[PDB]
């Protein structure tokens, strides 16, 4: 422990210097386009506020790390600050796959999709999905948010090891459904939007190229960015179901930096 | 602030407004398409049929209601209307398609047919509009090849020179030179359209005749078609 | 178009009945609708309003708790359903078709009315002048409390002409536009406190009763009303 | 012979062409270029009239300067409150290829038309509650481009056929019918006096015609191709016309010649609806590339642009007290400039 | 048929023209007249006009 003072700084530092005017510029474009009728806008608009948001928390996890692992502000900036960083990064999974889905319903039903009040709906399904991702990270925040220990660290929502099965069984539980559930669908509403596609005349070989590989990779840049994160979470989960932590220590918070880049990778494929 | 009956006003309007809403729904969940054509082609043969099998004396357009898989569609065609046609053919711009028909078996006219379909295909306002040509009279055309009296090869020079493409599926079953003449009237209509489409908008070629009773149908996979190409534009897909 | 309404009789006190509205030849959906009523030998007075779509409802003080009022478009009839009826209830209900967009005639038809019996604040008061005023030319007044003119730059004050056996028809709306029908003999001026009706050639049909109204807030005030003879 | 008829007509329009390079002296630009530049006009968008669920052709306002009638080709027409922007009435039509629509002097009447080739006409005061059919009047032969009303009485309208027609609304008939043109009628414009009014057409040239006689006074021909828009000076001595070579010109009627043509080197597509303000000062002409600019058209200078419209602009109209203009285009919004 | 043609022609050529430059005199006498009455050409006041 305590390698973690170049990493996740450099990676935090780079998304507050371009993601920010980039979400920006993102959000911008995504209600442009919702004032011309379009419901993948809301998707798109609350999609760049959650990053947004993610981006704010950023600066004191910044300085939580750099100051090598102490949370100076006090106990209830770790809670908000912890809700608000843990929440958009599941806020963000699920508007992707809400994207995703989006895409594949026009494209492989084109004739009766949306076809009534879509704006509607697609603020519905936002507002739905805001309230369930609260309503799963809110017991996170029921606990005590700053847990010291003696190796000066007094840890914010981190447990080495974790406390009792009691955040083990959420951890699994947030893992098999705040990804790998969302992913699932982002994976298979694309591939049935590039299998829906085959069989028009329309599309020449060189437009399908296109799809195809924006289908196959937005999937692959998402998963690469929220996989080793969700891979060590499960992977420390299931095994408490200090050897191990003090092993796998650095490559978990390695993992976190790379999962929080994905505020520079949504705002550029889903609007440049 | 504002009086009672401007409440009253501002509540008649709301009234309004939700009305306009549910016109709305049936006003694009309903697909246009705009009918064309020349005095010799069936296309009233075509509306004929498609009314029939699915649901004013200088009136200028006609309107024609059918339905294929609970997806409902418009299908107008101009009755009075002079041959110049620079003017009101701007007003159909937002149409999914155009359904241009075509009479494949008089060799004759022809040539006007192609030039009014380059004409179409090539219009500043019907761009990003898609064209559904039925090379209607194909049984007559293939009575007139197999009859042998009168020849394309006058009409048209090229032919001599031209072979039936690999791509062609000739299904029932018939005399191969007659498959030679309407694929080549297919690839005419077709090196027209792909000229200078420019890729905004396709072209869908369809073997017809007025008899057949999947015009419906055919009509209602190249809209499907339409829409779903349309939508990946629109969706920031491509 | 008419209006044709029925439910009256005696009733006891403390008792309900349901009065309706059956209406025919005009488009119903779309027209606000009142009630109003008038004791068997006093003035008219504002019971209700029910919107078009049935979005906004109002009742007037007296009545607030008491009465409900509801409409059945596709039935085409008005209903008001009276519940715990005092002594101070037995009147002529009428019912009054009103439509509100800009330029519209409000208050324009007038039911033929039902005989209701019963056995034994900071509101716009209108005032008329007494109540007892041919080829002549009369000028009946009137005054209120508060000034009718809005900062849209409409008046709005109503002259309603009640001839001896029939309903209420309008003769002036906002005080400066003379009713569909009326003959070019009327017209109305005033200044947003006092206004005056005049009749420039008074007629054997001109005789009856004149009240006024106020629609700036509700409830709607008439006024007790002049009487020509 | 026909080649003697032909002979004769050549020399007669060289007679014509005489006369009228007689009459020239000085142009237009010449006696006007001693008077100060209006200076550049920077106009407001006030209000945003949404509701409409397609393009929108054809726009009038009302004689009391408040009232708006729009038509789209969804087959409504939507009467608006301009100064609060509350819809008083919605329309629906029989034949949604609608593409033009005006409103009675009176305020009592609406009238609309389009590829139907029926102009139906609207009594917006009945005794019911709704806006009912008065009349549909039927004899052209070709799409209703325009339609004006003289009198609640008398409409007067132009079609895709080479014809005119003034109407008896009461009876239904066709009072008069003006013959002339070459090519489609496009637009449509009545004098002041509402004695004369003009017609542009699709060729190139714009007649003066005389109601009560029934003949045309004057031919004009100046354009390059087809005329899409046309409107009086308030004088009635005058009007300007836009075409589809990116140039507006105006006419007089009283010289009978073209005075001065409003064109740009950056222009290039048509002008699609030209109408003046209440001096005859500003020439605003809408254009096909999403913005309506703005012409002294005494001195052939653009003053200024008026940009806000994601689709080419169809309708464009002056009110009566000269305090609004409105705009109207093929994203289905209207807007009040000022 | 184009006898009517040559008609109308010729009763389109014999009208009395003025001058081109007394033509364009009125139109700015009647442009400079009408100056004041125009809220286009000369904005009106922030409290006169009904879209503000």
């Not at chain 1, 608000?84 to 895409?103: E, K």
């Not at chain 2, 939700?18 to 005095?39: I, M, P």
């Not at chain 2, 890729?199 to 779903?228: K, L, M, W």
């Not at chain 4, 005061?125 to 009303?149: D, I, P, Q, W």
Request: charged fraction near 20%; aromatic fraction near 10%; charge should be neutral.
């Amino acid at each position: 422990s305590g390698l973690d003072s170049v990493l996740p700084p450099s990676l935090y530092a780079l998304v507050f210097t371009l993601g920010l005017p980039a979400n920006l510029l993102a959000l911008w474009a995504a209600w442009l386009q919702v004032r011309k009728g379009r419901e993948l806008g809301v998707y798109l608009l609350n999609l760049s506020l959650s990053d947004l948001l993610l981006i704010c928390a950023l600066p004191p996890w910044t300085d939580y790390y750099l100051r090598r692992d102490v949370w100076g502000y006090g106990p209830g900036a770790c809670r908000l600050f912890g809700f608000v960083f843990y929440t958009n990064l599941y806020v963000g999974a699920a508007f992707l796959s809400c994207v995703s889905a989006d895409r594949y319903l026009a494209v492989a039903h084109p004739l009766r999709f949306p076809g009534a009040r879509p704006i509607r709906s697609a603020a519905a399904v936002s507002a739905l999905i805001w309230m369930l991702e609260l309503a799963a990270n809110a017991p996170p925040l029921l606990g005590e948010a700053i847990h010291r220990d003696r190796y000066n660290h007094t840890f914010c929502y981190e447990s080495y090891p974790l406390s009792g099965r009691g955040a083990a069984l959420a951890n699994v539980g947030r893992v098999l459904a705040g990804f790998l559930l969302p992913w699932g669908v982002m994976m298979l509403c694309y591939a049935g939007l590039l299998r829906a596609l085959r069989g028009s005349a329309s599309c020449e070989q060189r437009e399908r190229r296109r799809v195809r590989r924006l289908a196959l990779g937005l999937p692959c840049v998402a998963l690469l960015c929220y996989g080793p994160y969700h891979a060590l979470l499960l992977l420390r989960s299931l095994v408490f179901l200090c050897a191990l932590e003090e092993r796998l220590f650095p490559a978990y918070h390695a993992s976190l930096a790379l999962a929080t880049l994905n505020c520079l990778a949504d705002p550029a494929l889903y609007c440049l | 602030t504002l009086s009672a009956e401007d409440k009253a006003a501002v509540e008649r309007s709301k009234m309004i407004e939700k009305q306009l809403q549910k016109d709305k729904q049936v006003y694009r969940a309903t697909h246009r398409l705009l009918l064309l054509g020349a005095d010799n082609s069936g296309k009233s043969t075509i509306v004929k049929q498609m009314r029939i099998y699915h649901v004013v004396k200088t009136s200028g357009i006609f309107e024609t209601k059918f339905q294929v898989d609970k997806v409902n569609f418009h299908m107008f065609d101009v009755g009075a209307q002079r041959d110049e046609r620079r003017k009101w053919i701007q007003c159909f711009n937002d149409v999914t398609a155009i359904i241009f028909v075509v009479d494949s078996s008089d060799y004759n006219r022809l040539q006007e047919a192609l030039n009014d379909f380059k004409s179409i295909w090539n219009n500043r306002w019907l761009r990003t509009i898609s064209v559904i040509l039925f090379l209607n009279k194909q049984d007559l055309l293939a009575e007139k090849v197999l009859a042998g009296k009168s020849k394309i090869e006058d009409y048209f020079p090229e032919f001599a020179r031209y072979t039936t493409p690999e791509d062609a599926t000739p299904e029932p079953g018939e005399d191969p030179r007659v498959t030679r003449a309407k694929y080549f009237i297919r690839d005419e209509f077709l090196r027209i359209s792909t000229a200078s489409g420019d890729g905004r908008h396709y072209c869908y070629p369809h073997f017809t005749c007025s008899v057949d009773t999947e015009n419906a149908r055919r009509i209602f996979n190249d809209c499907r078609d339409i829409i779903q190409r349309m939508h990946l534009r629109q969706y920031e897909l491509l | 178009v008419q209006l044709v309404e029925s439910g009256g009789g005696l009733v006891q006190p403390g008792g309900s009945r349901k009065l309706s509205c059956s209406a025919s030849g005009f488009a119903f959906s779309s027209f606000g609708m009142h009630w109003v009523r008038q004791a068997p030998e006093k003035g008219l007075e504002w019971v209700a309003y029910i919107s078009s779509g049935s979005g906004t409802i109002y009742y007037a003080d007296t009545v607030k708790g008491r009465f409900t009022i509801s409409r059945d478009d596709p039935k085409n009839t008005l209903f008001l359903q009276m519940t715990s009826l005092r002594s101070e209830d037995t009147a002529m209900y009428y019912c009054v078709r009103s439509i509100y967009y800009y330029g519209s005639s409000p208050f324009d038809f007038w039911g033929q009315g039902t005989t209701l019996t019963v056995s034994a604040s900071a509101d716009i008061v209108m005032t008329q002048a007494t109540s007892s005023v041919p080829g002549e030319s009369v000028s009946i007044s009137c005054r209120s409390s508060k000034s009718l003119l809005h900062s849209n730059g409409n008046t709005y004050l109503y002259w309603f002409l009640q001839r001896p056996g029939q309903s209420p028809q309008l003769l002036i709306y906002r005080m400066s536009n003379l009713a569909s029908g009326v003959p070019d003999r009327f017209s109305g001026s005033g200044s947003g406190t006092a206004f005056t009706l005049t009749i420039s050639r008074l007629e054997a049909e001109d005789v009856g009763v004149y009240y006024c109204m106020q629609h700036l807030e509700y409830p709607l005030t008439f006024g007790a009303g002049t009487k020509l003879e | 012979e026909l080649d003697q008829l032909r002979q004769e007509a050549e020399q007669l329009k060289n007679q014509i062409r005489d006369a009228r390079k007689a009459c020239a002296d000085a142009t237009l630009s010449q006696i006007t270029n001693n008077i100060d530049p209006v200076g550049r006009i920077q106009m407001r968008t006030r209000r945003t009239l949404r509701g409409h669920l397609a393009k929108i052709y054809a726009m009038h306002w009302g004689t009391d300067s408040r009232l708006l009638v729009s038509a789209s080709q969804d087959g409504k027409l939507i009467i608006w409150d301009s100064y609060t922007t509350n819809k008083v009435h919605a329309i629906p039509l029989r034949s949604s290829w609608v593409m033009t629509c005006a409103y009675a002097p009176s305020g009592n009447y609406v009238a609309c038309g389009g590829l139907d080739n029926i102009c139906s006409i609207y009594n917006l005061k009945t005794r019911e509650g709704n806006v009912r059919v008065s009349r549909e009047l039927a004899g052209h032969t070709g799409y209703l481009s325009c339609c004006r009303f003289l009198d609640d009485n008398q409409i007067v309208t132009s079609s895709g056929d080479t014809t005119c027609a003034l109407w008896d609304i009461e009876t239904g008939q066709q009072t008069t019918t003006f013959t002339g043109h070459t090519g489609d009628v496009m637009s449509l414009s009545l004098a002041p006096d509402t004695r004369l009014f003009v017609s542009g057409a699709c060729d190139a040239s714009a007649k003066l015609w005389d109601v009560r006689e029934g003949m045309c006074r004057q031919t004009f021909t100046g354009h390059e191709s087809d005329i899409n828009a046309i409107c009086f000076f308030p004088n009635g001595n005058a009007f300007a016309t836009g075409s589809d070579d990116a140039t507006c010109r105006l006419f007089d009627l009283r010289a009978d010649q073209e005075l001065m043509t409003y064109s740009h080197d950056n222009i290039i597509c048509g002008i699609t609806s030209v109408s003046f303000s209440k001096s005859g000062r500003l020439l605003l002409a809408g254009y096909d590339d999403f913005n309506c600019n703005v012409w002294d058209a005494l001195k052939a200078d653009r003053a200024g642009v008026l940009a806000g419209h994601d689709n080419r602009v169809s309708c464009l109209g002056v009110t009566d007290d000269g305090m609004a203009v409105a705009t109207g285009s093929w994203d289905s919004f209207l807007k009040i400039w000022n | 048929q184009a006898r009517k043609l040559v008609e109308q022609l010729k009763m389109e050529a014999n009208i009395d023209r003025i001058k081109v430059s007394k033509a364009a005199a009125d139109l700015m006498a009647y442009c400079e007249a009408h100056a004041k009455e125009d809220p286009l050409l000369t904005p009106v006041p922030a409290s006169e006009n009904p879209f503000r």
